[PDB]
Amino acid sequence: KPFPLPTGYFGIPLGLAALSLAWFHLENLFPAARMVSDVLGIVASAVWILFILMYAYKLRYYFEEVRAEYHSPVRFSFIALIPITTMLVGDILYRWNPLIAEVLIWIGTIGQLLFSTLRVSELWQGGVFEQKSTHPSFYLPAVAANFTSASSLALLGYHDLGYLFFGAGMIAWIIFEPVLLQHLRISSLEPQFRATMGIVLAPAFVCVSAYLSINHGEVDTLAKILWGYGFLQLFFLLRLFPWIVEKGLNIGLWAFSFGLASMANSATAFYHGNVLQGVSIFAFVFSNVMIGLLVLMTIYKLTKGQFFL
Amino acid sequence: KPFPLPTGYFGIPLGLAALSLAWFHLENLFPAARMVSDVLGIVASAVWILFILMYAYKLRYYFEEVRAEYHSPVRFSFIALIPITTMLVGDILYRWNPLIAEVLIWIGTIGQLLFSTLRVSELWQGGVFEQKSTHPSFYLPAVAANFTSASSLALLGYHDLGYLFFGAGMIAWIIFEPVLLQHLRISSLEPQFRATMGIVLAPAFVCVSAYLSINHGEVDTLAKILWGYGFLQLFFLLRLFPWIVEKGLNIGLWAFSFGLASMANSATAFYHGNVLQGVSIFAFVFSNVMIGLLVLMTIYKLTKGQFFL
Amino acid sequence: KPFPLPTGYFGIPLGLAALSLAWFHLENLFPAARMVSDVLGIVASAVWILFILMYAYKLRYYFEEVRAEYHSPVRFSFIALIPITTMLVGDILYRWNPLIAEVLIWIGTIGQLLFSTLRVSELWQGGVFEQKSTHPSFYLPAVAANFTSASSLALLGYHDLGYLFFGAGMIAWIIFEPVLLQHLRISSLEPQFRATMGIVLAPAFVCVSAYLSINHGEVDTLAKILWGYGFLQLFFLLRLFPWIVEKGLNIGLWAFSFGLASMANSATAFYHGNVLQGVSIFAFVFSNVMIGLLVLMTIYKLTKGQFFL
Ligand SMILES: CCCCCCCCO[C@@H]1O[C@H](CO)[C@@H](O)[C@H](O)[C@H]1O
Numbered sequence: 001k002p003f004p005l006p007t008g009y010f011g012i013p014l015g016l017a018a019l020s021l022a023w024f025h026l027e028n029l030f031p032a033a034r035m036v037s038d039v040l041g042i043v044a045s046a047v048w049i050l051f052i053l054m055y056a057y058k059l060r061y062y063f064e065e066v067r068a069e070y071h072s073p074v075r076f077s078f079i080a081l082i083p084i085t086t087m088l089v090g091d092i093l094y095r096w097n098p099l100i101a102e103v104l105i106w107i108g109t110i111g112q113l114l115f116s117t118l119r120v121s122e123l124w125q126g127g128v129f130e131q132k133s134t135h136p137s138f139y140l141p142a143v144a145a146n147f148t149s150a151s152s153l154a155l156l157g158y159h160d161l162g163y164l165f166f167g168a169g170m171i172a173w174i175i176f177e178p179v180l181l182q183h184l185r186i187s188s189l190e191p192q193f194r195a196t197m198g199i200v201l202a203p204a205f206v207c208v209s210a211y212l213s214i215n216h217g218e219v220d221t222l223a224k225i226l227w228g229y230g231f232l233q234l235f236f237l238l239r240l241f242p243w244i245v246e247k248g249l250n251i252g253l254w255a256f257s258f259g260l261a262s263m264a265n266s267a268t269a270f271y272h273g274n275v276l277q278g279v280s281i282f283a284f285v286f287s288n289v290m291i292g293l294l295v296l297m298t299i300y301k302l303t304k305g306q307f308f309l
Numbered sequence: 310k311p312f313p314l315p316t317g318y319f320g321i322p323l324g325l326a327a328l329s330l331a332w333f334h335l336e337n338l339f340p341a342a343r344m345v346s347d348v349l350g351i352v353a354s355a356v357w358i359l360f361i362l363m364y365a366y367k368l369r370y371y372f373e374e375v376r377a378e379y380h381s382p383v384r385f386s387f388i389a390l391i392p393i394t395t396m397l398v399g400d401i402l403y404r405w406n407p408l409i410a411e412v413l414i415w416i417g418t419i420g421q422l423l424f425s426t427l428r429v430s431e432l433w434q435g436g437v438f439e440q441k442s443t444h445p446s447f448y449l450p451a452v453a454a455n456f457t458s459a460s461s462l463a464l465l466g467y468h469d470l471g472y473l474f475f476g477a478g479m480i481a482w483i484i485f486e487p488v489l490l491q492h493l494r495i496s497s498l499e500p501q502f503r504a505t506m507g508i509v510l511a512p513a514f515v516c517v518s519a520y521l522s523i524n525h526g527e528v529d530t531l532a533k534i535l536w537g538y539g540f541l542q543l544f545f546l547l548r549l550f551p552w553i554v555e556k557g558l559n560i561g562l563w564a565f566s567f568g569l570a571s572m573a574n575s576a577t578a579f580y581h582g583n584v585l586q587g588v589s590i591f592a593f594v595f596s597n598v599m600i601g602l603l604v605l606m607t608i609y610k611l612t613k614g615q616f617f618l
Numbered sequence: 619k620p621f622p623l624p625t626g627y628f629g630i631p632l633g634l635a636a637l638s639l640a641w642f643h644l645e646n647l648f649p650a651a652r653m654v655s656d657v658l659g660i661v662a663s664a665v666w667i668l669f670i671l672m673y674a675y676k677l678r679y680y681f682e683e684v685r686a687e688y689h690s691p692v693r694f695s696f697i698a699l700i701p702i703t704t705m706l707v708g709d710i711l712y713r714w715n716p717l718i719a720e721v722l723i724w725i726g727t728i729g730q731l732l733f734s735t736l737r738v739s740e741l742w743q744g745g746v747f748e749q750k751s752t753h754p755s756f757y758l759p760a761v762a763a764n765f766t767s768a769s770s771l772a773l774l775g776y777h778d779l780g781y782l783f784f785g786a787g788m789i790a791w792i793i794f795e796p797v798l799l800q801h802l803r804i805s806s807l808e809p810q811f812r813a814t815m816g817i818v819l820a821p822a823f824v825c826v827s828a829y830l831s832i833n834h835g836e837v838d839t840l841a842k843i844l845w846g847y848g849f850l851q852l853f854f855l856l857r858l859f860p861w862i863v864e865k866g867l868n869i870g871l872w873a874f875s876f877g878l879a880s881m882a883n884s885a886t887a888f889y890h891g892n893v894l895q896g897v898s899i900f901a902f903v904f905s906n907v908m909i910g911l912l913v914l915m916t917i918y919k920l921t922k923g924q925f926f927l
Pocket residue numbers: 066067070079
């Protein structure tokens with residue numbers, strides 16, 4: 001029974017793949033962490049394969065739906081999930097096959113850069129994007145895709161090239177967030193989009209995780225600064241959580257998984273660097289519990305014929 | 310004759326307490342600086358006690374006025390003056406009683422973080438905050454409170470935790486200022502609020518003062534960068550001063566005292582580091598003269614039954 | 619046949635002077651680079667002299683046109699080209715006569731700081747600047763003028779003072795760009811102003827070029843970060859180029875020459891530091907070809923009686 005896969009579902013393998021990598025970084029401190037990493041990584045990779053196959057079907061048989069999402073000044077952003085997750089799967093696979101991993105990383109990096117270059121810039125022509133288009137999802141092509149390239153390139157040994165992507169994402173972040181939070185202040189985000197508030201958790205933690213990958217895990221002043229703003233945003237989003245889910249818990253809450261998983265990844269580096277170890281443990285446990293809850297609610301929905309379109 | 314204390318009056322002990330700390334930092338260069346520091350610090354602490362007592366009375370007998378200021382998307386910010394000044398008084402008291410100082414610092418830090426977490430985030434629900442709510446006072450809970458925690462925690466020996474607060478404030482600053490200055494460009498701030506333009510002086514100087522506390526007074530590239538933007542803002546506000554006071558000099562001009570006092574504090578570190586010593590001397594003298602003028606106009610108003618509500 | 623010189627034409631000597639300085643920095647790697655630098659520098663200096671003479675005539679005989687551009691919340695910005703180019707000519711002249719160079723640098727630095735202090739701040743009074751005034755040209759007095767002072771002061775040996783100007787420009791940039799790109803998203807820039815999109819290329823490259831002047835050419839994390847965002851903007855502007863010139867190629871395209879020339883200058887430092895040498899070569903060649911095309915189209919227009927007003 002054919003159906004067009006909602007692009008946002010790539011957030012599921014994305015969150016799982018990022019959490020696999022966080023656990024990978026604990027292996028030398030806690031050897032059993034590698035088994036947990038490998039299991040999360042295989043599950044994320046499997047889900048990614050499936051979703052890539054489903055999306056290839058969407059492109060072949062439901063192309064006009066993709067074209068409409070592509071030209072939308074709001075919905076285009078979710079497409080960036082595709083190359084982001086491709087890169088994270090490459091990072092996972094690198095532990096087993098660096099050749100295949102490097103192919104996936106380059107495909108994702110070229111694909112996300114071509115994507116942004118075509119669409120993010122086109123917004124600057126005016127008249128299509130409106131004030132009401134100012135959504136957290138914009139972080140995906142503008143910010144998160146660049147941080148993911150930064151960290152993946154560093155994994156491959158291209159640290160200086162990674163810094164270029166890092167810079168592109170960090171400055172893009174700082175340049176978009178002001179107008180986003182002002183818009184949220186003035187305009188009440190409608191319930192159907194509120195789960196995407198979870199993406200507001202992402203920038204500072206995805207940023208510091210990419211930074212720590214490129215700088216060999218040196219926890220310095222910048223990294224601490226980023227963690228500070230990251231936790232501020234976490235506390236804000238926690239207070240806002242009842243309003244976020246005013247209309248009920250739903251699968252869109254996977255939007256939080258990117259920032260959660262990056263908070264866990266960055267915590268491993270803070271722990272290794274003997275900076276705020278107690279905070280690190282808390283951060284790492286919290287993010288795992290929250291993602292575990294997402295998995296449980298996803299298994300629940302799956303067994304009730306919900307989930308898919 | 311009972312009366313409800315206007316919350317903004319906490320700006321007076323705030324400015325004096327911050328100026329006490331600036332002088333404290335000169336003691337080893339100029340021993341008489343410690344007497345000047347102690348006198349400013351005792352006066353600020355005394356005024357703070359009084360104002361805290363008056364505000365406790367406001368909470369008990371005029372609670373609905375506090376509730377209205379609290380839920381206002383503009384007036385809520387002045388409440389942040391309370392924990393900020395509590396921390397600065399703790400910093401002063403630390404020279405005499407580190408135990409009491411540490412209690413005040415933690416009360417202020419927890420109180421300001423709870424405050425922001427409850428109210429600054431709630432703004433993101435939309436529909437209450439309006440474009441016309443975009444006032445410089447927002448810096449108080451969003452930016453200045455975090456910088457004050459950063460510096461106070463560093464005083465207590467919690468440097469890495471201080472960096473987290475520093476980061477939260479520095480990034481929050483950069484994220485709010487763009488929309489503030491655009492709003493000021495487009496919308497003429499009404500005279501009754503114009504004294505609060507003085508708060509625009511604060512961010513860069515309060516930032517660098519907190520930075521220098523946490524990094525042991527090392528005047529590095531970041532510190533110089535911050536000073537640069539700080540002076541730009543000073544020059545802009547000086548040119549704007551006749552327009553700020555178009556409707557007359559008033560007590561609201563204490564709004565400038567936070568940035569002035571922080572400019573004096575940061576100047577002590579620049580002087581100790583042998584960076585721009587001539588600029589430092591100028592900055593330190595200027596801020597003291599300006600705060601001295603504020604004291605004189607406050608003594609004036611006090612002797613004319615003006616001042617209080 | 620008297621005529622009032624359009625202020626924007628100072629962009630021509632500006633671009634050429636900045637490109638002279640980029641080549642100057644290659645002299646020790648490639649000795650023939652000094653001849654290319656000297657020729658570009660003499661041509662830029664000659665054009666500057668002429669344009670300064672023409673503008674002195676405009677001030678004497680067409681003063682009301684200058685007054686109107688000065689008080690315009692949009693057109694005032696182009697006036698900043700005057701002190702910027704004065705400084706860059708001083709930087710060029712320094713190779714032959716450091717005394718004269720230092721006079722020009724100080725005149726430009728004092729002039730641009732007085733200019734911004736008078737006009738950029740005055741915008742904050744509200745009611746004159748409108749949303750539709752949010753143009754890329756604002757970068758000139760707010761950002762580029764400060765970076766140029768930073769680098770020129772460093773040339774003169776005033777590195778710490780240069781850092782203050784650097785800071786003023788870097789933070790000003792970060793504070794304006796968010797509202798600029800949001801405005802471009804929402805409002806289609808009209809064709810007659812679209813050439814000024816070229817100024818969007820400038821900030822990151824002019825920033826890193828100034829940074830590298832003040833920090834003795836040390837290619838560090840900040841410099842790489844800036845280059846990253848710089849290239850992102852380049853790719854975006856390249857995709858947008860057909861829309862920029864939808865109504866035809868014109869002399870306003872000299873607006874791109876500031877970012878192009880700074881990209882070439884920064885590339886010399888990256889090359890000297892053995893960072894991304896291949897990218898550096900590409901950047902340096904690209905910018906030269908693009909500026910060469912501008913020269914060719916300018917010679918073309920000159921020989922067809924176009925060009926001047
Ligand atoms: C995975 C993301 C892919 C997004 C699909 C790109 C949409 C391209 O867009 C369309 O392509 C058509 C021709 O094929 C043109 O005729 C249309 O003008 C254009 O709208």
